[PDB]
Design an enzyme around this catalytic site. Structure first.
Site, mmCIF file in Angstrom:
data_model
loop_
_atom_site.group_PDB
_atom_site.id
_atom_site.type_symbol
_atom_site.label_atom_id
_atom_site.label_comp_id
_atom_site.label_asym_id
_atom_site.label_seq_id
_atom_site.Cartn_x
_atom_site.Cartn_y
_atom_site.Cartn_z
ATOM 1 N N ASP A 65 0.835 -1.224 0.000
ATOM 2 C CA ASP A 65 0.000 0.000 0.000
ATOM 3 C C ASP A 65 0.863 1.265 0.000
ATOM 4 O O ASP A 65 0.393 2.326 -0.402
ATOM 5 C CB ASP A 65 -0.953 0.047 1.232
ATOM 6 C CG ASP A 65 -1.787 -1.245 1.433
ATOM 7 O OD1 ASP A 65 -1.644 -2.242 0.674
ATOM 8 O OD2 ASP A 65 -2.626 -1.256 2.361
ATOM 9 N N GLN A 99 -7.258 7.757 -1.977
ATOM 10 C CA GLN A 99 -6.813 8.983 -2.617
ATOM 11 C C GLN A 99 -6.077 8.655 -3.897
ATOM 12 O O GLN A 99 -4.948 8.154 -3.829
ATOM 13 C CB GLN A 99 -5.911 9.798 -1.667
ATOM 14 C CG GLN A 99 -5.761 11.267 -2.061
ATOM 15 C CD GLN A 99 -7.112 11.986 -2.282
ATOM 16 O OE1 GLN A 99 -7.386 12.460 -3.367
ATOM 17 N NE2 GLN A 99 -7.952 12.029 -1.254
HETATM 18 N N1 LIG Z 1 -11.338 -9.905 9.418
HETATM 19 C C1 LIG Z 1 -12.109 -8.836 9.175
HETATM 20 N N2 LIG Z 1 -13.450 -8.894 9.327
HETATM 21 C C2 LIG Z 1 -14.232 -7.817 9.077
HETATM 22 N N3 LIG Z 1 -13.719 -6.634 8.666
HETATM 23 C C3 LIG Z 1 -12.369 -6.533 8.509
HETATM 24 C C4 LIG Z 1 -11.532 -7.627 8.754
HETATM 25 N N4 LIG Z 1 -10.256 -7.240 8.523
HETATM 26 C C5 LIG Z 1 -10.299 -5.954 8.141
HETATM 27 N N5 LIG Z 1 -11.581 -5.530 8.137
HETATM 28 C C6 LIG Z 1 -12.060 -4.186 7.769
HETATM 29 O O1 LIG Z 1 -11.982 -4.157 6.322
HETATM 30 C C7 LIG Z 1 -11.464 -2.836 5.926
HETATM 31 C C8 LIG Z 1 -10.075 -3.035 5.337
HETATM 32 O O2 LIG Z 1 -9.144 -3.643 6.290
HETATM 33 P P1 LIG Z 1 -7.597 -3.628 5.806
HETATM 34 O O3 LIG Z 1 -6.824 -4.386 6.839
HETATM 35 O O4 LIG Z 1 -7.237 -2.273 5.383
HETATM 36 O O5 LIG Z 1 -7.713 -4.451 4.479
HETATM 37 P P2 LIG Z 1 -6.672 -4.417 3.194
HETATM 38 O O6 LIG Z 1 -6.887 -5.671 2.555
HETATM 39 O O7 LIG Z 1 -5.293 -4.064 3.700
HETATM 40 N N6 LIG Z 1 -7.301 -3.124 2.361
HETATM 41 P P3 LIG Z 1 -6.592 -2.569 0.977
HETATM 42 O O8 LIG Z 1 -5.084 -2.433 1.207
HETATM 43 O O9 LIG Z 1 -7.157 -1.139 0.799
HETATM 44 O O10 LIG Z 1 -6.874 -3.379 -0.254
HETATM 45 C C9 LIG Z 1 -11.403 -2.002 7.178
HETATM 46 O O11 LIG Z 1 -12.698 -1.435 7.387
HETATM 47 C C10 LIG Z 1 -11.156 -3.046 8.247
HETATM 48 O O12 LIG Z 1 -11.623 -2.561 9.512
HETATM 49 N N1 LIG Z 2 -2.663 3.946 -1.969
HETATM 50 C C1 LIG Z 2 -2.953 4.507 -3.135
HETATM 51 O O1 LIG Z 2 -2.226 5.302 -3.700
HETATM 52 C C2 LIG Z 2 -4.273 4.071 -3.794
HETATM 53 C C3 LIG Z 2 -4.982 4.961 -4.595
HETATM 54 C C4 LIG Z 2 -6.168 4.579 -5.201
HETATM 55 C C5 LIG Z 2 -6.669 3.292 -5.019
HETATM 56 N N2 LIG Z 2 -5.965 2.384 -4.193
HETATM 57 C C6 LIG Z 2 -6.483 0.994 -3.986
HETATM 58 O O2 LIG Z 2 -5.645 0.271 -3.028
HETATM 59 C C7 LIG Z 2 -6.033 -1.113 -3.279
HETATM 60 C C8 LIG Z 2 -4.937 -2.101 -2.739
HETATM 61 O O3 LIG Z 2 -4.152 -1.434 -1.775
HETATM 62 C C9 LIG Z 2 -6.228 -1.229 -4.820
HETATM 63 O O4 LIG Z 2 -7.432 -1.935 -5.104
HETATM 64 C C10 LIG Z 2 -6.307 0.227 -5.305
HETATM 65 O O5 LIG Z 2 -7.429 0.479 -6.231
HETATM 66 C C11 LIG Z 2 -4.753 2.784 -3.600
HETATM 67 MG MG LIG Z 3 -3.971 -2.770 2.928
#
Ligand SMILES: Nc1ncnc2c1ncn2[C@@H]1O[C@H](COP(=O)(O)OP(=O)(O)NP(=O)(O)O)[C@@H](O)[C@H]1O
Ligand SMILES: NC(=O)c1ccc[n+]([C@@H]2O[C@H](CO)[C@@H](O)[C@H]2O)c1
Ligand SMILES: [Mg+2]
EC number: 2.7.1.22
Length: 179
Positions: free
Chosen positions: A38, A127
């Protein structure tokens, strides 16, 4: 070089809870670093747009993978100085990036249904923010491209049910790791 290390890959669909799981694991393991994919997205000014005007964020071209690989290499180069050092690398596009194939000591993949994925996604603000119809138009298609790219994987990937609670997911990986 110079010490044993233990490298864990955690990937999965967007919003499957990868970042939360990595952070929770890091809280309870000694000498544990986390590198988050990320952190290595290019700025919006450098992202392409496709035929239908969708920003191309959900492909490896959206990321500075030289900079992420550098951070991963630097962790490895410096691990021996910290003394088994643990590295968790977590990100939505890991297991289709060939330079990492041989680094993993454990590989986990978080899966959630499309409906729950879409639901979670709508609770997030990125963003830039998701444009209208971005999820069906870009995110889910690119996720399926990934999964099919993953069909050539030769090592074992442990598939995890990301609809389990955050604490159940932690515990499941934790129990696996100390074994
Ligand atoms: N095990 C879970 N059960 C329910 N909700 C969860 C769980 N884990 C994470 N979340 C929620 O799901 C959303 C994303 O959690 P996050 O740990 O950021 O996932 P991610 O896979 O890293 N997201 P992304 O990097 O944007 O693709 C947030 O609202 C968390 O609070
Ligand atoms: N972190 C970023 O710059 C950014 C901007 C726009 C969308 N996303 C989303 O992050 C997810 C995995 O981390 C992907 O599905 C992106 O679309 C990230
Ligand atoms: Mg993430």
């Amino acid at each position: 070089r110079g010490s044993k290390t233990f490298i864990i890959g955690i990937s999965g669909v967007t919003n499957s809870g990868k970042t939360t799981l990595a952070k929770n694991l890091q809280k309870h393991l000694p000498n544990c670093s986390v590198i988050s994919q990320d952190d290595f997205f290019k700025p919006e000014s450098e992202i392409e747009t496709d035929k239908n005007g969708f920003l191309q964020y959900d492909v490896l071209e959206a990321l500075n993978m030289e900079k992420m690989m550098s951070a991963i290499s630097c962790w490895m180069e410096s691990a021996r100085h910290s003394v088994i050092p643990i590295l968790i690398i977590e990100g939505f596009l890991l297991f289709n990036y060939k330079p990492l194939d041989t680094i993993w000591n454990r590989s986990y993949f978080l899966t959630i249904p499309y409906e729950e994925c879409k639901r979670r996604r709508s609770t997030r603000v990125y963003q830039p923010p998701d444009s209208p119809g971005y999820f069906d138009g870009h995110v889910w298609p690119m996720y399926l491209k990934y999964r099919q790219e993953m069909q050539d994987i030769t090592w074992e990937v442990v598939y995890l049910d990301g609809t389990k609670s955050e604490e159940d997911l932690f515990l499941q990986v934790y129990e696996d790791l100390i074994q």
